[PDB]
Symmetry: D2
Subunit: 387 residues, 4 copies
């Protein structure tokens, strides 16, 4: 059996809500810790964190709230990031929920966000600052706008957790400006740009790269309801703000157009390299429906954005995807990651049979760097009951 | 005996810290409820509120933290506002505290502020929006600044509670920009002005009145470490932002100079009348030391600010102050407040003998309106142990 | 509207479960406080107690547990005790519950009992000792017996609350020995007797009166599964232990037989008088089904038990019951109690129409004393949703 | 560094009291887990338990209450039990405390006892029944006796925790009858005997062995204020009730007199063997002051009690004690325990230097069985600040 869930033996979950969430996701998270090749102390250490801070935050077990972050809508999903031979890392995307979420007292779920954010500040966490994130929230609050609004997707922020191989967690926060933009009847990008600009006199290090993205977005009508924003919980210097968006139907040409941001960054050799490898997968993988997602990461020092795409897998035979996914690793030359992948997939879902499963894996992310190589992460069915 | 503290009979305070605060301020608060002439249901209604939300927030009973708001430093003080015959209202100024306050984990006591701010949002309160207050906080966070700072008065925010005669509480928030200003080596007003301006594109209704004050402050070197800011927790339309300040030594001419903001607002007839009554008290009252405080209230629609002063009484025989205080009510012609005041003062401090007491009563506020008449509020010794 | 529920305005019920109970029983409890003619401070004072200690203890709102105490099974019911002209008193029967109640971890609901019993010991309550009640609990625990039993009515204990006109609560505790007896395959009385005897060397003041009851119980086959036990939470001197039981079918002669405990206490003149009045009601009231209940109260100093009967009213037109119930008050000569009763009945149930109602009032209790006169209490539909 | 305290990194202790207890005993417990040779999963597993249930129960950090269990009075002490080559086990003796302990509301510290006992019952613990222990508590409660008493050692109960090598805890409970006996002005043994007898009709399996002990105790005037009682939290069949006591001054002959319980059990060969070894230690060890303690364990099935003694070591050079203690292990022929002990002792107290320390180890327990061999346990300085 899988190990880290040994802690619960001498723990009593206060509410029935929590007990049911534990039963729904407890084992599953323990398995990803195992599949993440984490040190046994670290496994229990993050297991500890999961129980105390995330299980309370899931809210009522029979969940009444759909979270924007998941295809299915439940407030959590688990991620594995694969690297060049180093190993794999585990990722959690979170949207705090309570019984008030979606109700008269909090129809758009701001309350749990601020609650959870104080738990985290209470925990003695390395390099944990909130100002930048506070800034974006303030930029997107509502008030009397709620009243307008009350007369789709309702969540207004989200969280992310990266458990690095060291026993350290890194906290990632999201912001969904669709609500704020819709209430003011102002195009999303106009306030996104103005939101980015408002931090520019605060420090003008994102102007170049962003204005470079905002131009391509306005060219291509890339901005839409689905566009949203991201950031890290740390000192501004080391912070990486990210802009996400989606497109309903996308061809390879459109993908190349976006990956090169029009033609903005054909000059950089990295992108050209990154785009080549990308079509190798595009061919493996796909060889009313879910959209494809894109990402532009604005490291502050640099002059260009770094792209990243998210590719729908739910709807594709999770075995075909495991197979093709493994073929692509040999092409890159990852010895252990490609050989033991599909065995690692069944060991996460022993109840299910990959031969016939489709929803078990939902997204794949692609990034490329000269230094790192090929970033790539897989997003999974993150509960233990499958329809 | 006084009534409203009957609730405590069948209530158990969880920590020893809370129990000791109840013993220190519980009866006293019950008495102010009485002296405010509140409906008995409302007394228990606000008494309920006091126990659940404010007693937890006071922190360690032997308090480790000095709050900026009080002369003595304790995180609470009670106010009575007297009106033209209508009656009196009760006011509480609050700074949440915990055992972490002043420690490495939160050396400047930001954590309790955001905690309490979520309790209030969870309570179903009429007309309660946080965006404006959130905006100012974001404008004054610190992060790496803490580390510089760690190498006076430390608080960054505070709360205010107005209990109107109806069973409704109104929430007032404060902000102390001295910290943010000291870390960035930027004069307070420049970021105050820039802080106000940042809300001007957000809505430019404070520009005229504020720029009108900021000119006088820069004329007179009025800005100082002690300058801070205020506002209300409601819709921007009905919100009244306030700038406070202090002066070490001040003459009547200095008072007149300030009340008329230099000469900015001699045009308004209101000011001249209000100043007239004001000297009427100045003469009664005063007829290394504590400073005198001023306030400029920027109602958004209007074109001028409304002044308000705060007058030191701690150090003056609290009976002499009661006597002089009541004479001034007849001059105004308030039949009942002036006749039954000093009896109302002793009934708040039956343990003490006003003949010899000095610290029981600490500040007096003065505002004047054509419509309202004479605003005036008294700030008291708000614990039950007197040195 | 009814008053005491004004407290909830500035209170947030932590769980969804509690919120739903408040909505279900909150208004109703406020009305019984009103209908009890309690001083307005005391109303809020007991209303305070109800919110903090009883609402948490009700457990899941869609209740998973049937309580033995109620005909319907819900863990609470309200009582009014009518006296000779003095006034009326409010009574609550309680069984604490949690989501664990009825589960593997606590299949017979012992856990909630002990939790609530500590809350109460924490409250500073006058004349509150637990030794006597603990004694009965110890005598009726299970352990390995639970396992046997897992292979009807399941509860092992319950609470009762008397709110006297003074701001003081008196706590009444119950015990249901059917389980312990069924596990040990021992007739209930033999261990009940041995339970009473175990306190006899502890103090032999109940021997005479009890042995007097145990004989009649063995004569008439009175003991049965439904027999259970009661007591008060105070000093042994002032404690009144009671034995209850039931009979499926009962005639007047059986009633007379039981009231005079066979012939055990025909000698006492009180009994004869009390029995006379009793038939006066039996005639008014009744002029697969619910049983009739009896009670024998063993005051320690005295030598005889005092009886008490409980009469099914659910199934009787609650108006017919009100009319006849009030006629009987004139017979005794209670001026105000008899005139304003049925108006007091509708004012408790304005949503319902007494002309058509049957379940609104369920039991009537009868005791007689030379000193007190006629004890008599009414048991009501104690939730706000009626089927 | 020592490992198990890694859990604290991502946990925030709610109160300052808890934080200070963590800082005072947290590392030390982590080290005993290490010194017990527990599986790393089990270490964290018990570490989890220690943090959630025992740190809360210690009460105010600057402790206001003296616990009967410890020489110094602090409510906790850690034990190591050494066996024949199998390994060692870790033991914790606990007395729950709160800020109410010793106050008017609970002058003899009963409330924390019942609270902790409910946490434990909520935990799904193997073979956890409370009936036997509840029986003893009820036999020793007070009520009006409290008031008498208010007009030494005050605690009435305590807990013990055995962490077996498997990830399972066994709960041991204590009871201190001196208070109940002092109240009723009745000698301790009479009610202890009557207490044991009351469980005899409940099951008469302890009669023979106990009546066998009660005779020697009233022969030798062995009963005294210090006499108290113990038991296990499980099914009566597997329960081992124990009687403890003390003697001010004791010679070897007295020890032989006590070990052989007068002459009651010279017939048994075990005792004679056990006593031989015992003098072997007495000579090694000792070769206004603390008393020496004895224990008689009444396994229900058997016909004789098994003794156990406790020998004062605090006051003896803890290195001399380690040396002599280790020599005795070779005499028995325990290879690894004897070679690496004093290295194991310094590794528990690296801050201290055994050359000069005296209080680091406080008691040694000795038991003998034919089957087990030589039971023997050491009781240590169980906080991290040494005077
Ligand atoms: O279908 C969707 N999936 C998520 C992806 C996601 C998974 N996890 C996340 C965590 C944070 C942000 C986004 C995500 C998302 O971003 N959507 C935008 C509108 C529709 C919806
Ligand atoms: O002496 C002082 N009193 C408070 C007044 C106060 C009472 N209550 C308050 C509530 C909110 C803000 C201010 C106050 C104040 O504003 N000071 C500024 C620097 C020195 C310090
Ligand atoms: O139908 C019933 N009613 C309750 C009466 C009750 C109301 N409230 C109470 C409170 C405590 C004890 C008993 C009661 C009772 O005693 N029963 C015994 C078996 C059937 C079941
Ligand atoms: O000095 C003493 N030590 C404890 C020993 C102990 C350690 N841990 C324990 C745990 C449970 C019971 C007893 C103990 C004890 O039993 N005493 C009886 C009277 C004096 C006091
Ligand atoms: C599925 C969508 C829209 C986003 C996934 S979030 P992420 O895992 O890519 O975040 P990082 O790559 O770690 O920045
Ligand atoms: C004593 C000082 C500097 C400020 C008092 S805050 P306040 O009572 O004046 O608040 P309002 O007048 O009610 O706006
Ligand atoms: C309906 C049944 C069986 C019992 C009611 S318990 P009680 O209210 O009679 O308790 P007291 O009469 O107040 O002693
Ligand atoms: C120091 C004293 C009086 C008692 C110690 S309790 P203990 O360690 O002997 O408990 P067990 O031996 O495990 O029964």
């Amino acid at each position: 059996p899988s190990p880290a869930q040994a802690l619960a033996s001498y723990h009593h979950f206060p509410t029935n809500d929590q007990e049911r969430w534990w039963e729904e996701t407890g084992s599953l998270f323990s398995r990803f810790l195992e599949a993440g090749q984490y040190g046994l102390p670290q496994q229990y250490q993050f297991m500890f964190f999961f129980m105390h801070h995330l299980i309370p935050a899931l809210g009522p077990y029979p969940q009444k709230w759909r979270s924007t972050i998941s295809r299915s809508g439940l407030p959590i999903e688990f991620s594995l990031n694969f690297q060049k031979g180093s190993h794999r890392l585990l990722r959690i995307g979170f949207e705090p929920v309570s019984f008030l979420s979606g109700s008269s007292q909090d129809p758009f779920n701001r309350i749990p966000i601020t609650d959870l954010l104080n738990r985290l500040s209470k925990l003695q966490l390395s390099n944990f600052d909130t100002p930048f994130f506070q800034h974006l929230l303030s930029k997107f609050q509502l008030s009397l706008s709620e009243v307008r609004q009350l007369q789709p997707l309702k969540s207004q922020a989200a969280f992310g957790f990266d458990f690095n191989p060291d026993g350290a967690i890194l906290v990632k926060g999201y912001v969904f400006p669709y609500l704020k933009a819709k209430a003011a009847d102002v195009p999303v990008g106009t306030l996104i740009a103005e939101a980015v600009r408002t931090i520019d006199v605060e420090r003008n290090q994102f102007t170049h790269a962003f204005g470079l993205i905002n131009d391509y977005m306005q060219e291509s009508t890339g901005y839409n309801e689905y566009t949203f924003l991201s950031c890290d919980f740390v000192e501004t210097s080391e912070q990486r703000l990210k802009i996400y968006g989606a497109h309903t139907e996308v061809t390879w040409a459109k993908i190349a157009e976006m990956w090169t941001l029009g033609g903005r960054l054909i000059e950089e050799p990295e992108i050209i390299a990154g785009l080549a490898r990308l079509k190798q997968i595009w061919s493996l993988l796909q060889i009313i429906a879910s959209p494809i997602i894109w990402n532009y990461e604005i490291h502050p020092g640099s002059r260009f954005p770094v792209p990243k795409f998210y590719l729908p897998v739910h709807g594709e035979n999770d075995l075909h995807v495991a197979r093709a996914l493994a073929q692509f690793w040999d092409s890159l030359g990852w010895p252990e990651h490609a050989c033991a992948y599909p065995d690692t997939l069944q060991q996460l879902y022993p109840d299910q049979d990959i031969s016939q499963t489709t929803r078990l894996q939902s997204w794949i992310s692609y990034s490329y760097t000269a230094k790192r190589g090929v970033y790539m992460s897989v997003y999974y069915h993150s509960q233990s009951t499958y329809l």
